[PDB]
Write a protein that binds this ligand. Structure first.
Ligand code: CHL
Ligand code: CLA
Ligand code: CLA
Ligand code: CLA
Ligand code: CLA
Ligand code: CLA
Ligand code: CLA
Ligand code: CLA
Ligand SMILES: CC1=C(/C=C/C(C)=C/C=C/C(C)=C/C=C/C=C(C)/C=C/C=C(C)/C=C/C2=C(C)CCCC2(C)C)C(C)(C)CCC1
Ligand SMILES: CC1=C(/C=C/C(C)=C/C=C/C(C)=C/C=C/C=C(C)/C=C/C=C(C)/C=C/C2=C(C)CCCC2(C)C)C(C)(C)CCC1
Ligand code: SF4
Ligand code: SF4
Ligand code: SF4
Lengths: 35, 31, 55, 95, 80, 194, 732, 166
């Protein structure tokens, strides 16, 4: 059922998982050498 | 009356498709 | 041998992505409740009404 | 029928007005005021292919060249006047 | 690096050159002014952008102008 | 060779060399060359376990034994702790041997691949059908065959979800065709970059 | 070189951390990108507009989904005055048990946030009643957002990508936006109101299921096409009408009653439907003005060309401005921002006084939050409009082409404009501050009767002209003459009932405190305009720096020579004017909030007494209404205002951190970073890890921006926390 | 020859090569040739679907299987709508994907007759929908009522008399 499950999954997903992947990914791209 | 679980998950799947389309638009912009 | 497959960077990337998914799923399903977080425990108290009798 | 008489008459009246009274003035104004131009050249002349002028706007046997767009503009004016008259009349009657 | 431009109002007083802390500017022969010399900026890559030349230029308006552009190591004045 | 839909474009790293290669990898998980053999072997393993699971579920269900979801609670000779210790030891040894063999290293291969793929789909189907309706696979099949028109996934509790997903699947290749014919197909990014 | 500044080689080769910061900052400045043509500029702008429109629609769909799923929209609809709206559930792992037990408001079984955005009143007024309707709306807007994302993707392909000339087609764009984006949209909204919102307000639910079967009016379209349009106004809603029920419910769908619905204290929905209909007609007519493809209509170039004053007082008139506006994206952006900011101010100033949503006037926290929201947005948009005009003067202004037109004339008498702006600002500030200080002293010295209390008779006289009978001028609508007699056929009874009532805020009573604060507002607007107009007109050069146009819009300075040229750029003029904009908007919303709080406690005398001197604002408004806010959490537990207390202190933190970036400047920090570089390089076990980008201090412009952002963020968050917490603590 | 009388000259992009070409592009939509070809195919498709819809509606109403066509979705066939979408979407996706790949891979009188009957079927389907909205009688029944009382049953009266028949 959605109400009892989805908040407890998506709040860490959007506030811990997605930030981690996004920052790591952006770091890897920004520091990626032009060549 | 609360929303049914099927309603929430259908809207969430539509959101996932919308997010895919947003990624397509972002990649196209980056070109 | 304990780090046989992990010596590759992209193998570590897959490990950490899978670990992130499993930890977030388990936390939202079972981990939070097991730790007895106050947010997982219900309010279990009578409610209070704001001013102008606004619940 | 009151609405039909006043409305049809009004629309046709506006059409005739556009055809003879302000037609020379309107045509003189569109002669004086050129086509819209960007950077000194028309939108179509600058590359806006979607700004290609229509062809049906000149296909007219009217002595004064009252094309279909002139018909639609003056019929709109006549419909606006007529419905304003109807609406105002209804106010004056029941309010 | 930055961009340093010398304009023909220069009187060849050499003050821009003497004020430069990175040796970007130099005096060259020139018939346009009485003094017989105009400044130039060959070593533009070394311009940190401190604009001491503009501060030391007496001519109104300035004959030397520094336009801050792409920032390199030397332009940023980093010892690291 | 036929791809995962008529009109698809196989990824350049999917050239039909591997068994069962239908050029299906929208998320580019096998795009990296060095992990692609690992992902092949993960497919083969998950398929093999799903095949064994499908056999052990269907035979158990059709022979009147306890239901697959209930089979854990049955009274066995060995308790949970000793059984999991046995499992840990023997599967660790066997998987060590499998890993070292993998480190060392047509028709039948493709057959196995397809079979495993069907199994994994069929096992996911059994788990989902139990989770939605509470009916075992043969009971679910009998219920479907009794009233095929109205007793189905798309009329269950997750029916609208399934209808939306099938709509997405049906309308995906048309959008991919537009993307090919209009765009250049020169993506510098992959859905899974690693 | 690195790949992140894909659009800037000069930043790609930068070896310092400034690369990352300036690649973030200059990402959306498409005009300064390497190898950027005008066609690519316009196509990318078009697709970005598609993108953030899809963002807007996803934001709206998210609001709808959260209210539908986690909100209490049905229960709120049952008892709008005794149910606090719910925004969304809180799932915070950091909450303690008192926090979980204190944030559970409404009828929720989980911690929630009380929706102060008014979306409940708006959605109830438009006919939405159940969570299913809100869910359907959210799903539809999800589909719309996906459609716009696909449209952006499609119009980025070379076949579908439009040329520059398509964007430069001004006549067609404005014709279609006036007729269709404005006019037809207003017509469709009217159709919604007539078919759905009004019937839902009168009790009968008209959804898509029973749409096409329930006539919105007892008569069909016969009165419409037979011209008997007054039938649709025959029987309006009764004064004793309860919203959402059939008691005292009329049948008229379109009318001009005016005033407010007595039970909801908001505008009559039939009035607002008739309103949108009239707008639809006017704008559909207006969208046929210009000539596109059919040999009729005006040409905007020639409109501008023919409007030149014969006496030559304006110079060459508007000759050459069509191409100036059309080719300058910054001119268009400044105009659009100017208008949008004025509109946002108008929405703030009209929604509080003329609430369009049922049960919005009774919810005071939402009114305060909405007014503050739109005024701060308006002020920022205004600052942007002026900044983009300065950018137009630098990048896009052509003196040779604009020779002799009003714009070159502005350049010619810019000194007069700036000097008179300085004069009016100095006069206003001297006299307003002096009168405030005088009143402070007289109150301090125990003789408040000696205060200079100027009665604002001009605004009171306007109110008397507009129907207010408090002051007794009795001239135009308060008196008995032709204007009132003409008004008293349709609208004026309801307007007079609304304006002469002490409860609503249609035209509040005005006193000497209102005089002094409006003059403070005038000071703020005149000074912000001074700074911004000075930045725009001196953007291209001044006596201190004649060749300012060669340095771009935003540069740090021109060195310490010539006495010093700090904050000389037009960007720096904007940066300075944002402070004055925040100050002015804060003055306006402090005035709003205090006057309304006095009204809502029922004692307007408090504001009318204590608003004439600054200590009264500091004591009876700031100190007095901050009591419950700061007591959100304390050693004796916490309550529902602990989050707003934390945000209050949070905004204070950001404001102070901004002060750091604003006061201390680069060169102290650069040397400090140099010592830190040495330390890291010479630390054992830490020299194993080395930076890819050389760490450097924030550049001058960058840090000015960072400090301004912190200043503004702390400003907005502190005041949002205050205005919400105090109003909710006293009224819910 | 042309949608307007003889002193009408067609726009350049409509040179008469396509079947049923009467130079009717007053908005100039088909100026781009590749888009004109895509629109030719879209016209053919929408036309064929309008034909199928009109023919099916008239068949089910004249023969009396399904009067008042608009509620055919509500009628119970034993097969609920959700699974009907679930089976339609794969099959119709396959058919339309195959058709569009054929179109991208690539008698004049017969083609002209087809396109003209398509434009007629489009107009007819629009009329069926709007009449059904305003009158709530089936198409053939609406025709019968028009024949019996032409001045009592028409748009200029059915719009005047929505409340009495709805
Ligand atoms: C593929 C592996 C696997 C899967 C999908 C499940 C799945 C499940 N087990 Mg587990 N199990 C699995 C491995 C194992 N289980 C158990 C022992 C048990 C017991 C004893 C029970 C479960 C039960 C359950 C259910 C969770 C409640 C669910 C059906 C419970 C259940 O539903 O039975 C009624 C239960 O009682 N499992 C053992 C022995 C060590 C396993 C060995 O690998
Ligand atoms: C922009 C709109 C918006 C906003 C601000 C929020 C905000 C929130 N949502 Mg909601 N949500 C939205 C749209 C939005 N949602 C939509 C359209 C859906 C699909 C129907 C959902 C479905 C949803 C569920 C099912 C749940 C939340 C939850 C949450 C909360 C935090 C966890 C989270 O972020 O997971 C959000 C989950 C996602 C799967 C992502 C959905 C976001 C939309 C679809 C995309 C928005 C992107 C944005 C415009 C651009 C981002 C780029 C950049 C600016 C960062 C928070 C109150 C959870 C909650 O209530 O926790 C207490 C929860 O359980 N949301
Ligand atoms: C250290 C303390 C702390 C922490 C970590 C949190 C954390 C959280 N709180 Mg809690 N809270 C705290 C203290 C804290 N709180 C205190 C003291 C109070 C007062 C009692 C509250 C009151 C409170 C309430 C009332 C609510 C929360 C909510 C939340 C959640 C936000 C959901 C989310 O992740 O959205 C995603 C994160 C954001 C949207 C933040 C965006 C901000 C950034 C900086 C904007 C700019 C972005 C920019 C583009 C850069 C992005 C980089 C990116 C790629 C990484 C989160 C779990 C909410 C919640 O649970 O709803 C689901 C909620 O409603 N909290
Ligand atoms: C009928 C035809 C039509 C219509 C509907 C539109 C519609 C639109 N065009 Mg335009 N456009 C047209 C023809 C049309 N276009 C033509 C012929 C051309 C070629 C010249 C263009 C060229 C063009 C360009 C070049 C661009 C657009 C853009 C846009 C979008 C702007 C966003 C917007 O609507 O802001 C929302 C605005 C309104 C709804 C109207 C504003 C009214 C005021 C400000 C507010 C009043 C609101 C009201 C009081 C209610 C508010 C409260 C309520 C919500 C509670 C919009 C969807 C932009 C874009 O890319 O977006 C994708 C863009 O850059 N158009
Ligand atoms: C429709 C509106 C609109 C549009 C299209 C633009 C477009 C543009 N502006 Mg304009 N502008 C606008 C509104 C607009 N702006 C407004 C309202 C303001 C006033 C605030 C400005 C002020 C402004 C200045 C001063 C400048 C521009 C510039 C530009 C250009 C580049 C933007 C840039 O540098 O990258 C994108 C910008 C950024 C990434 C910086 C955003 C940083 C924000 C402020 C951080 C905010 C923090 C966040 C809210 C806090 C979260 C909450 C907290 C609790 C954690 C571009 C042409 C620049 C330029 O070169 O022009 C040619 C320039 O110098 N504009
Ligand atoms: C409360 C703080 C404060 C005050 C009083 C001022 C006052 C002023 N600013 Mg400043 N400003 C401030 C904060 C402040 N600013 C901040 C933080 C910023 C952001 C950087 C700015 C940015 C700014 C800009 C960018 C501009 C101004 C301008 C102005 C003037 C506006 C005209 C006016 O009101 O004249 C009335 C003047 C005053 C109220 C000043 C004080 C005069 C006092 C009352 C007289 C004292 C007499 C008394 C005998 C003194 C005893 C001293 C004795 C010991 C010698 C004025 C001098 C504008 C300007 O110059 O316009 C001409 C302008 O361009 N200011
Ligand atoms: C194409 C098309 C068009 C124009 C309509 C038109 C309509 N449908 Mg149908 N419908 C279609 C395809 C279409 N439908 C398909 C492919 C399905 C799935 C098999 C349905 C299933 C369906 C149902 C189940 C219902 C409609 C209903 C309706 C009405 C709303 C309207 C007459 C409703 C209706 O008949 O109202 C009386 C209704 O309940 N439609
Ligand atoms: C192939 C074209 C065609 C034909 C043969 C018919 C024939 C008919 N229509 Mg239909 N109709 C059409 C197109 C057509 N219509 C279109 C395009 C529309 C949309 C505007 C309508 C909307 C419509 C309505 C709303 C109604 C009819 C009705 C009728 C009947 C009354 C006579 C009449 O046409 O007055 C109607 C005439 C018009 C609407 C003028 C335009 C007709 C075409 C374009 C010529 C008759 C059976 C009425 C009925 O039930 O009896 C009725 O109530 N029609
Ligand atoms: C044959 C001929 C003739 C005659 C002709 C005619 C007579 C024509 C006509 C025509 C017409 C007769 C036309 C019309 C037109 C119309 C129109 C085009 C309309 C429009 C409308 C509108 C636009 C509307 C709007 C509105 C509405 C919708 C509602 C609201 C209000 C209003 C009104 C605003 C003659 C003998 C001379 C000569 C020879 C030939
Ligand atoms: C910098 C620049 C820019 C920008 C600027 C700006 C931003 C401005 C603003 C401006 C503004 C913001 C303005 C405003 C205005 C307003 C007005 C003008 C108003 C009016 C009103 C009226 C007229 C009214 C009347 C009346 C009354 C009194 C009341 C009642 C009703 C009536 C109607 C009767 C540009 C880009 C352009 C250019 C370049 C430079
Ligand atoms: S630039 Fe200014 S300072 Fe340097 S030489 Fe020419 S004049 Fe003298
Ligand atoms: S800026 Fe500093 S370095 Fe560059 S030239 Fe002028 S003085 Fe020499
Ligand atoms: S900013 Fe700092 S450095 Fe640049 S001029 Fe002003 S003071 Fe000298």
């Amino acid at each position: 059922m959605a109400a009892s499950l989805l908040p407890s999954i998506f709040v860490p997903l959007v506030g811990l998982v997605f930030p981690a992947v996004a920052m790591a990914s952006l770091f890897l791209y920004i520091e990626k050498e032009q060549v | 009356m609360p929303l049914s679980d099927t309603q929430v998950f259908t809207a969430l799947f539509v959101a996932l498709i919308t997010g895919i389309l947003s990624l397509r638009l972002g990649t196209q912009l980056y070109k | 041998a304990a780090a046989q497959g992990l010596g590759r960077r992209e193998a570590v990337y897959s490990v950490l992505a899978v670990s992130a998914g499993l930890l977030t799923v388990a936390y939202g399903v079972k981990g939070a409740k097991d730790a007895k977080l106050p947010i997982t425990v219900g309010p279990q108290q009578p409610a209070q009404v704001g001013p102008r009798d606004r619940i | 029928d009151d609405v039909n008489v006043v409305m049809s008459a009004s629309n046709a009246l506006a059409l005739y007005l556009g055809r003879f009274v302000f037609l020379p003035y309107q045509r003189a104004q569109v002669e004086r005021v050129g086509m819209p131009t960007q950077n000194g050249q028309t939108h179509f002349a600058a590359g806006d292919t979607r700004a290609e002028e229509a062809s049906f706007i000149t296909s007219t046997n009217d002595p004064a060249g009252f094309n279909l767009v002139d018909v639609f503009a003056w019929g709109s004016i006549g419909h606006a006047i007529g419905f304003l008259a109807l609406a105002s009349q209804s106010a004056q009657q029941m309010l | 690096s930055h961009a340093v431009k010398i304009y023909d109002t220069c009187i060849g007083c050499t003050q821009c050159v003497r004020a430069c802390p990175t040796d970007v500017l130099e005096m060259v022969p020139w018939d346009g002014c009485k003094a017989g010399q105009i400044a130039s900026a060959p070593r533009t890559e070394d311009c940190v952008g401190c604009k001491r030349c503009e501060a030391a230029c007496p001519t109104d308006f300035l004959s030397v102008r520094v336009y801050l552009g792409s920032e390199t190591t030397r332009s940023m004045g980093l010892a690291y | 060779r036929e791809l995962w839909y008529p009109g698809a474009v196989a990824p350049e790293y999917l050239n039909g060399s591997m068994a069962g290669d239908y050029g299906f990898d929208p998320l580019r998980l096998g795009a990296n060359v060095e992990t692609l053999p690992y992902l092949q072997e993960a497919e083969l393993m998950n398929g093999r376990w799903a095949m064994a699971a499908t056999a052990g579920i269907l035979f158990t269900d059709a022979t009147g034994l306890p239901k697959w979801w209930e089979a854990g609670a049955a009274d066995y000779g060995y308790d949970f702790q000793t059984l999991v210790a046995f499992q840990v030891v023997v599967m660790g040894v066997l998987e060590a041997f499998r890993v070292r063999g993998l480190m060392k290293t047509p028709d039948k291969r493709v057959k196995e691949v397809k079979n495993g793929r069907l199994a994994m789909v069929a096992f996911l189907g059994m788990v989902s059908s139990y989770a939605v309706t509470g009916l075992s696979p043969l009971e679910a099949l009998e219920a479907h065959m009794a009233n095929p028109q109205a007793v189905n996934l798309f009329t269950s509790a997750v029916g609208g979800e399934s209808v939306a997903f099938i709509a997405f699947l049906s309308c995906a290749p048309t959008f991919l065709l537009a993307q090919k014919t209009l765009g250049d197909g020169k993506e510098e990014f992959r859905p899974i970059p690693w | 070189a690195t790949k992140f500044p894909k659009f800037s080689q000069g930043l790609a080769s930068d070896p310092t951390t400034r690369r990352i910061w300036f690649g973030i900052a200059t990402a959306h400045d498409f005009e300064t990108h390497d190898g950027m043509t005008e066609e690519k500029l316009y196509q990318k702008i078009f697709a970005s507009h598609f993108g953030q429109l899809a963002i807007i629609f996803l934001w709206t769909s998210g609001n709808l989904f959260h209210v539908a799923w986690q909100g209490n929209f049905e229960k709120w609809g049952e008892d709008p005055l005794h149910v606090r709206p719910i925004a969304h559930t809180i799932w915070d792992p950091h909450f303690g048990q008192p926090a979980v037990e204190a944030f559970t408001r409404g009828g929720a079984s989980a911690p929630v946030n009380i929706a102060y955005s008014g979306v409940y009143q708006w959605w109830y007024t438009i006919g939405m009643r159940t969570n299913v309707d809100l869910y359907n709306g959210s799903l539809f807007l999800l589909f719309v957002a996906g459609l716009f994302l696909f449209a952006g993707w499609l119009h980025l392909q070379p076949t579908f990508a439009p040329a520059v000339s398509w964007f430069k087609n001004a006549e067609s764009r404005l014709n279609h936006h006036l007729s269709g984006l404005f006019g037809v949209s207003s017509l469709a909204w009217t159709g919604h109101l007539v078919h759905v919102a009004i019937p839902a307000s009168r009790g009968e639910t008209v959804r898509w299921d029973n749409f096409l079967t329930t006539l919105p009016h007892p008569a069909g379209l016969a009165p419409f096409f037979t011209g008997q349009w007054a039938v649709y106004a025959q029987n309006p809603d009764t004064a004793g009408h309860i919203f959402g029920t059939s008691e005292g419910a009329g049948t008229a769908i379109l009318t001009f009653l005016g005033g407010f619905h007595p039970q909801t204290q908001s505008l009559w929905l039939t009035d607002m439907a008739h309103h949108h209909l009239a707008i639809a007609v006017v704008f559909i007519i207006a969208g046929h003005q210009y000539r596109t493809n059919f040999g009729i209509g005006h040409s905007m170039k020639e409109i501008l060309e023919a409007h030149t004053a014969p006496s030559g007082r304006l110079g060459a008139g508007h000759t050459g401005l069509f191409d100036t506006v059309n080719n300058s994206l910054h001119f268009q952006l400044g105009l659009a921002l100017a208008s949008v900011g004025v509109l946002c101010s108008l929405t703030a100033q009209h929604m509080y006084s003329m609430p369009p949503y049922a049960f919005l006037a009774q919810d005071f926290t939402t009114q305060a939050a909405l007014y503050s929201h739109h005024q701060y947005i308006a002020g920022f948009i205004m600052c942007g409009a002026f900044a983009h005009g300065a950018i137009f003067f630098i990048r896009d202004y052509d003196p040779e082409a604009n020779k002799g037109n009003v714009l070159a004339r502005m350049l010619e008498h810019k000194e007069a404009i700036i000097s008179h702006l300085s004069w009016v600002s100095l006069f206003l500030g001297f006299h307003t501050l002096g009168l405030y200080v005088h009143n402070d002293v007289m109150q301090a010295f125990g003789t408040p009767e000696k205060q200079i209390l100027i009665e604002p008779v001009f605004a009171q006289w306007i109110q008397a002209a507009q129907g207010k009978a408090l002051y007794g001028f009795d001239i135009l609508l308060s008196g008995d003459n032709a204007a009132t007699a003409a008004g008293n056929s349709i609208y004026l009874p309801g307007w007079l009932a609304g304006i002469n009532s002490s409860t609503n805020s249609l035209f509040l009573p005005i006193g000497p405190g209102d005089f002094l604060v409006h003059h403070a507002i005038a000071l703020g607007l005149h000074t912000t305009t001074l700074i911004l107009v000075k930045g725009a007109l001196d953007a291209r050069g001044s006596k201190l720096m004649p060749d300012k146009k060669d340095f771009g819009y935003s540069f740090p300075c021109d060195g310490p020579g010539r006495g010093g040229t700090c904050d000389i750029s037009a960007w720096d003029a904007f940066y300075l004017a944002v402070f004055w904009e925040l100050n002015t908007v804060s003055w306006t919303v402090f005035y709003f909030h205090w006057k309304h709080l006095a009204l809502w406690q029922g004692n307007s005398a408090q504001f009318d007494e204590s608003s004439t001197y600054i200590m009264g604002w500091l004591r009876d408004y700031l100190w007095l209404n901050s009591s419950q806010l700061i007591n959100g959490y304390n050693p004796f537990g916490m309550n529902s205002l602990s989050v707003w207390a934390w945000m209050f202190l949070f905004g204070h933190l950001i404001y102070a951190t901004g002060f750091m970036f604003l006061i201390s400047w680069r060169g102290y920090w650069q040397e400090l970073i140099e010592t830190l570089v040495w330390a890291h390089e010479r630390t054992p076990l830490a020299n194993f890890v080395k930076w890819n980008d050389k760490p450097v201090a924030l550049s001058i412009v960058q840090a000015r921006l960072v400090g301004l952002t912190h200043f503004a963020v702390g400003f907005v968050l502190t005041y949002a926390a205050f205005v919400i917490a105090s109003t909710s603590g006293k009224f819910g | 020859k042309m949608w307007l009388p003889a002193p009408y000259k067609a726009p350049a992009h409509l040179d008469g090569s396509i079947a049923g070409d009467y130079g009717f592009d007053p908005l100039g939509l088909g100026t781009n040739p590749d888009r004109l070809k895509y629109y030719q195919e879209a016209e053919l498709m929408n036309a064929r679907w309008a034909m199928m819809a009109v023919a099916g509606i008239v068949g089910t109403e004249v023969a009396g299987i399904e009067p008042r066509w608009w509620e055919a979705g509500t009628e119970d066939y034993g097969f609920p709508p959700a699974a009907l979408l679930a089976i339609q979407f794969p099959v119709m996706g396959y058919l339309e994907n195959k058709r569009i790949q054929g179109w991208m891979a690539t008698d004049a009188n017969m083609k002209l007759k087809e396109i003209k009957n398509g434009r007629a079927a489009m107009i007819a389907f629009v009329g069926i929908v709007v009449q059904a909205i305003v009158y709530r009688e089936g198409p053939v029944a609406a025709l019968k009522d028009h024949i019996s009382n032409p001045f009592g049953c028409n748009m200029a009266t059915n719009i005047m008399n929505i409340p009495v028949n709805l």
